[PDB]
Structure 1
């Protein structure tokens, strides 16, 4: 059926989403899972901030809708079309990138289709497993150890790092993979278009 989480709301706002869920028989949870069908984002009059629920929502090719879907569907005393409320973008990667949509329609051709990714080093605003979960949803295959990369010529390995979380340009010294920054993933995921690694490469010492 339907299952929702919310992002960037206030309790009153949440109250409304509840009221909405209550009336329409929609399941409403604190945590996002595979089952979650909808992510309701606080937006301007339809840009939201980039939250984790925001990313995993796109990663799952789910319904990433602005809070206005809710308040209107209450105002109209009926449930409107997820289609005319969607999140057209966000502050970070442009107010007009249509990420979520792209994501819904692209469930065959996933941006990280046929990749091997190792989220290496420590991470901040994201549990690594969540970052990892993210990339699995985008058709990447997760590696956990630099040295566990597959030898098949067909596959492409990538080391993802978040430089902030350290006290690491020697990666290229420990394997033969490109090193990029978490922004690569994030940026790729919002836009749902696998980015030119170029911008994101980290210097690897010989």
Structure 2
């Protein structure tokens, strides 16, 4: 059936979702899994939310990323409103209207990271490696654990991403032949659901 997960909400805001969840036989839960169908985000009146991890994984699964206004209007009108009307416009960081989740629902037959080998490299911070790995998988990429493990083949394009405010490196180029980008290449590529160009994102590689 329907299974719901919640993001950016207060206790009382949560209680409202639960009431809506109880009234409509919807499972509510703490952590997002593949079983999750809906991700309720807090937004401003014009469906703009902050980009949480559940935001990305939600879009990565191409679920229903939908504003908390879905919940309260549904309570107000005493009926389960259309998810279509309430979906999240975009976010505070990628722009007030990129309609990201929209494309993601519409494009499961061709996922943006199809045909790619991705290596989430070294230390990571707000987001753990495995979440980013699962994100990246969900969008049709193939995870590599170590640089040396890239399918050296005309077939696939390998990418290495890193987030550099963690290593408390620019010599990945010396250990493998791959584009090195910044974790924001993935996050934006997922937020916008377009496959971003690596130029704006490349980390310098010393010879």
Range that drifts further, 150-159 or 177-186: 150-159
RMSD: 0.5
* Aligned residue number for residue 145 of structure 1: 146
Inter-partner Cα distance in structure 2 for 1:130 and 1:124:
11
Inter-partner Cα distance in structure 2 for 1:152 and 1:51:
35
Inter-partner Cα distance in structure 2 for 1:203 and 1:112:
23
How far the C-alpha of 1:167 sits from its partner, in A, is 2.6
CA shift digits 1:109-168 (9 cap, x unpaired): 111111000000111000100000000000000000110000221100000000000131
Inter-partner Cα distance in structure 2 for 1:190 and 1:151:
29
CA shift digits 1:81-134 (9 cap, x unpaired): 000000011100001000001000000111111100000011100010000000
- Greater per-residue helix proportion: 1
Give the SS at the match of 2:87.
coil
**How does the TM-score come out when normalised to structure 1?**
0.99
* Aligned residue number for residue 47 of structure 1: 48
Inter-partner Cα distance in structure 1 for 2:84 and 2:104:
13
Inter-partner Cα distance in structure 2 for 1:98 and 1:108:
18
Inter-partner Cα distance in structure 1 for 2:155 and 2:48:
38
Consecutive unaligned residues of structure 1, counting only runs of 5 or more, are none
Inter-partner Cα distance in structure 2 for 1:140 and 1:69:
32
* Aligned residue number for residue 186 of structure 1: 187
Give the SS at the match of 1:163.
coil
**How does the TM-score come out when normalised to structure 2?**
0.99
Q: How many residues align?
A: 206
Divergent runs of 4+, >2 A: none
Give the SS at the match of 2:103.
helix
Give the SS at the match of 2:80.
coil
How far the C-alpha of 1:183 sits from its partner, in A, is 0.1
Give the SS at the match of 1:35.
coil
Inter-partner Cα distance in structure 2 for 1:197 and 1:138:
17
Give the SS at the match of 2:13.
helix
